Amino acid sequence: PEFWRIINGDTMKKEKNVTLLWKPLMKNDSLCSVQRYVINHHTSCNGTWSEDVGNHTKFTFLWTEQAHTVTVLAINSIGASVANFNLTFSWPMSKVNIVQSLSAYPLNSSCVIVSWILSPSDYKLMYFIIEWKNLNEDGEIKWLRISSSVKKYYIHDHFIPIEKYQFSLYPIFMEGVGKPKIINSFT
Amino acid sequence: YPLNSSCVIVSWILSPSDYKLMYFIIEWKNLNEDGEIKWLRISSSVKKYYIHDHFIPIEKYQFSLYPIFMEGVGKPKIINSFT
Ligand SMILES: *[C@@H]1O[C@H](CO)[C@@H](O)[C@H](O)[C@H]1NC(C)=O
Numbered sequence: 001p002e003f004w005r006i007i008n009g010d011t012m013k014k015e016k017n018v019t020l021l022w023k024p025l026m027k028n029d030s031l032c033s034v035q036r037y038v039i040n041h042h043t044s045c046n047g048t049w050s051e052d053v054g055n056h057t058k059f060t061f062l063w064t065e066q067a068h069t070v071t072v073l074a075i076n077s078i079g080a081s082v083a084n085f086n087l088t089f090s091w092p093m094s095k096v097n098i099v100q101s102l103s104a105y106p107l108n109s110s111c112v113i114v115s116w117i118l119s120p121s122d123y124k125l126m127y128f129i130i131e132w133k134n135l136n137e138d139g140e141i142k143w144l145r146i147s148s149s150v151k152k153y154y155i156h157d158h159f160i161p162i163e164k165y166q167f168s169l170y171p172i173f174m175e176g177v178g179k180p181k182i183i184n185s186f187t
Numbered sequence: 188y189p190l191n192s193s194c195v196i197v198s199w200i201l202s203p204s205d206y207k208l209m210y211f212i213i214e215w216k217n218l219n220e221d222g223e224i225k226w227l228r229i230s231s232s233v234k235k236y237y238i239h240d241h242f243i244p245i246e247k248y249q250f251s252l253y254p255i256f257m258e259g260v261g262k263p264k265i266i267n268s269f270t
């Protein structure tokens with residue numbers, strides 16, 4: 001699976017609610033069928049266990065402490081997956097910004113232009129998240145994972161000219177997720 | 188200058204000379220990416236051209252108008268920045 005973290009809370013509060021969302025596996029990716037999914041959490045106590053999420057697409061947790069790591073193992077009847085995606089949460093690196101600017105323009109109803117300019121940083125940079133949402137209705141969040149090597153990508157999605165949309169870019173580092181950049185419209 | 192995302196209008200001016208000119212070739216090339224060179228034909232009777240194609244307004248595009256006389260190609264003319 002490819003999980004995605006949703007946060008619904010104030011930045012001032014030290015405890016944040018994190019929701020995990022993943023796109024259902026396809027026939028080839030899961031090698032066919034996976035009967036049940038499991039999510040494991042990493043704790044400073046180093047407790048090894050398993051938590052069963054079910055076929056439900058939503059899972060919620062409350063993050064308070066420093067070092068937390070989540071791994072979504074897709075256990076099949078044969079066994080468990082060997083390679084999984086990875087993400088970290090912590091405070092100090094959530095303020096550093098490496099991307100100063102970005103712009104978004106509409107081509108038509110099928111594609112959107114996004115460009116960004118960033119600056120070199122001491123830590124290694126590998127990949128980025130770009131997602132979009134609608135303010136007219138509080139629907140589901142649509143997101144995509146892109147590489148940091150290429151500075152230019154066209155979003156292929158439906159877009160209503162009348163409705164006003166929100167775009168945002170999340171940076172990813174080994175230490176965690178940095179300061180998110182959210183764009184409203186032309187300014 | 189681009190009228191919108193799908194139309195660009197170019198303008199020029201000519202002066203009398205001993206040689207005569209027959210047609211013009213409109214050529215453009217991108218800066219950041221090394222894309223294929225696109226060229227178009229135009230006669231000298233009409234002074235305006237409405238280039239219609241898919242364009243991305245954000246990036247700069249380099250334009251070039253070249254003249255033709257009895258002896259062939261003349262001095263290249265380069266347009267680097269949008270007006
Ligand atoms: C997170 O997972 C990736 C790949 O699954 C791995 O390369 C990396 O070392 C992991 N990080 C930690 C802190 O376990």
Ligand SMILES: *[C@@H]1O[C@H](CO)[C@@H](O)[C@H](O)[C@H]1NC(C)=O
Pocket residue numbers: 107108109110111
């Ligand atoms: C929108 O533009 C894209 C190219 O950016 C093109 O593939 C698509 O066909 C266009 N939409 C329509 C409805 O023609």
Ligand SMILES: *[C@@H]1O[C@H](CO)[C@@H](O)[C@H](O)[C@H]1NC(C)=O
Pocket residue numbers: 190191192193194
């Ligand atoms: C741009 O202008 C040209 C010339 O009138 C027109 O054909 C075209 O429909 C216009 N494009 C848009 C997106 O309005």
Ligand SMILES: *[C@@H]1O[C@H](CO)[C@@H](O)[C@H](O)[C@H]1NC(C)=O
Pocket residue numbers: 256257258259
């Ligand atoms: C092409 O050939 C014709 C006849 O040989 C000549 O009149 C014409 O000038 C030539 N074209 C050019 C560009 O010289």
